Write a protein that binds this DNA or RNA. Structure first.
Length: 631
RNA sequence: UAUACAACCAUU
């Protein structure tokens, strides 16, 4: 099996050269040197310097040697790994820019010779693109080269017949929302609006959704299907200038890829297909399904009354068969003795509900089937204002109008998922993993603020605890205090549920641990644990099919490619630390199984381990996540 | 929003 990894063959050392110019301020001297070399120079109070790989590097202009200073320094990769990686990244960027590639944020390099206008839309250019990342595998350095495509307007924004919602800047590589382009003045979003001085440096960037929106997604899909493999194969010639640091003809090639078999245990059978839950019923149910209805108006009710009758007045409809198949003891639509109805109104303008005696006295698990007239752009008010004793279960009016069985089946599955006394399934390989506490960590720093969210689950997918903190002051010491506090809370929840400490604690991190790792290491404890870095955005891929495969890079680094009906995307898993009695291989398998310990619906599966999936989702919104995460 | 899907993500 091929991987898009390429071995870097250069001296593992960085050279720092110095220059001095008396006629010019050091910052300006460094800026001009950076511009002409496509490589950033740094400045001091008097000296300007550059850190380069220990390779032949001809600086521009030629006569710059007249400013060269005697001072030189050599830093081994041993003494400073990050400096070597930073320097190599900047060196790769320079080579691409020197060959007239455009740079785009994320180390995406847009080719300007491998460009063709789309047959479907004359005003759109399809630029062959390569995204480049640096990997440290088995004490050696590698370079992942992912062929992809960038669709840009052929003409600058003001001179482009077609338009989009995002502008790509040719110089900076950053993208900004497109506010307006009228009367020769182009305005971008920075929430600051700014008129631009060179609007010619801005092109329209077309995403997968715009291509659908502007009617050329068919050609966009075709290009991606059997014209990206040519991108993998065009690497040696198109990227030949990279011969300086690697041999593009020596590809990365028995038992370093294992297929993980996930079997679901239902009540009356087992399967590899989550959708067989309707064949063999919830692993645990015997619970009543209780529900009431909320409509945005009397009119909306009458618009869907026929479907409402077909679904809920026929006690043998697909809705009732789904609930029976999933193992619900009964289906009950509660009715207010006053109004004698199970149907109520909500204000679609304010997303509010009038509190009543009947609604207020509702106890236990009761689903609120809330009919939405259309997809709501800001659903936070609906969640925020809804009565907290009801389980909010919104559904689009149009999907009740047409009644596709798999949708109604999925809807009933979600309801079961949101009843804590239910368990749709347990994983066959997770049945003996109750002793472990699986924790996901989403922590970002942006301003001078910090955003934190943690989520803990057990071997069955039950959510033990979720903690979230908004707008913390960016300070390593303060942030790690709160981290410890939330971690202790999740720990106590496990004990609270299992009356014993977890024997092992899995800490899965969204990205890499950049905090004081030793501080974390100590307070994580007398409990055995493992520290795991998860990268949902890994650049390592292949033209081969790796879906549902786990690939070993080195002793502590794996990549799994979860099942998906979209493009093949990888998830990197790195065991930073481990003092559990599990081997790395066993830990990696448990992390992969965590992607299946719960389902939103049986027809799709999660890509990230469930605790991390929760942590990302809860951190993303103030209230919307309550629609997806049963907590 | 039954799922899913959302722009990028070491110069001015």
């Amino acid at each position: 099996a091929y991987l898009n990894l390429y071995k870097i063959d250069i001296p593992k050392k960085i050279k720092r050269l110095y220059f001095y110019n008396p006629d010019m301020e050091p910052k300006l001297f460094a800026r001009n040197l950076s511009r002409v070399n496509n490589f950033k120079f740094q400045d001091s109070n008097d000296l300007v310097w550059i850190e380069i790989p220990d390779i032949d590097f001809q600086i521009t202009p030629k006569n710059v040697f007249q400013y060269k200073v005697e001072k030189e320094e050599i830093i081994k990769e041993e003494e400073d790994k990050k400096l070597f990686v930073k320097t190599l990244y900047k060196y790769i960027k320079k080579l691409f820019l020197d060959n007239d590639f455009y740079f785009k944020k994320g180390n995406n390099f847009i080719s300007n010779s491998e460009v063709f206008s789309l047959d479907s839309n004359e005003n759109v250019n399809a630029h062959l693109t390569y995204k480049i990342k640096i990997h440290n595998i088995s004490n050696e350095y590698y370079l992942s080269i992912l062929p992809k495509f960038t669709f840009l307007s052929k003409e600058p924004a003001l001179e482009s017949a077609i338009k989009s919602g995002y502008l790509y800047n040719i110089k900076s590589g950053k993208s900004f929302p497109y506010i307006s382009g009228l009367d020769g003045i182009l305005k971008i979003d920075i929430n600051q609006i700014v008129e631009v001085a060179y609007p010619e440096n801005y092109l329209f960037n077309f995403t997968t959704r715009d291509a659908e929106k502007y009617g050329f997604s068919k050609e966009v899909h075709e290009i991606y299907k059997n014209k990206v493999f040519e991108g993998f194969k065009k690497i040696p010639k198109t990227l030949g200038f990279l011969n300086k640091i690697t041999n593009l003809n020596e590809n990365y090639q028995d038992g370093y890829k294992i297929f993980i078999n996930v079997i679901y245990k239902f009540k009356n059978g087992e399967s590899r297909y989550a959708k067989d839950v309707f064949k063999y019923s919830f692993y645990k149910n015997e619970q009543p399904l209780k529900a009431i209805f909320f409509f945005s108006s009397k009119k909306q009710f009458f618009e869907v009354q026929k479907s409402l009758k077909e679904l809920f007045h026929n006690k043998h409809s697909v809705f009732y068969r789904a609930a029976a198949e999933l193992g619900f003891s009964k289906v009950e639509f509660l009715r207010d003795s006053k109004t004698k109805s199970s149907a109520f109104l909500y204000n679609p303008e304010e997303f509010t509900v009038k509190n009543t005696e009947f609604i207020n006295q509702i106890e236990d698990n009761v689903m609120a089937i809330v009919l939405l007239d259309k997809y709501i752009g800001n659903i936070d008010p609906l969640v925020r204002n809804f009565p907290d004793n009801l389980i909010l279960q919104p559904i689009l009016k149009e999907k009740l109008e047409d009644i596709k069985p798999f949708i109604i089946k999925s809807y009933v599955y979600k309801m079961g998922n949101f009843i804590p006394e239910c368990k749709p399934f347990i994983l066959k390989k997770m049945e003996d993993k109750e002793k472990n506490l699986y924790i996901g960590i989403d922590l970002s720093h942006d301003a001078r603020k910090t955003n934190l969210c943690i989520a803990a689950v057990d071997n069955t997918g039950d959510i033990l605890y979720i903690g979230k903190h908004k707008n913390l002051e960016l300070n390593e010491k303060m942030n790690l205090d709160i981290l410890e506090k939330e971690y202790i809370k999740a720990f106590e929840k496990y004990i609270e549920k299992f009356n014993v400490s977890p024997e092992n604690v899995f800490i899965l991190r969204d990205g890499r641990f950049i905090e004081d790792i030793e501080i974390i290491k100590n307070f994580i404890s007398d409990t055995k644990y493992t520290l795991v870095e998860v990268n949902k955005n890994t650049n390592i891929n292949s033209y081969d099919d790796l879906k549902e495969w786990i690939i070993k890079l080195d002793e502590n680094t794996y990549i799994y490619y979860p099942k998906t009906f979209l493009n093949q995307k990888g998830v990197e898993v790195k065991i930073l630390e481990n003092n559990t009695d599990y081997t790395i291989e066993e830990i990696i398998e448990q992390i992969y199984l965590l992607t299946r310990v719960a389902h939103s619906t049986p027809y799709t599966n999660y890509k990230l381990p469930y605790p991390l999936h929760i942590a990302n989702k809860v951190a993303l919104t103030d209230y919307e996540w309550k629609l997806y995460i049963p907590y």
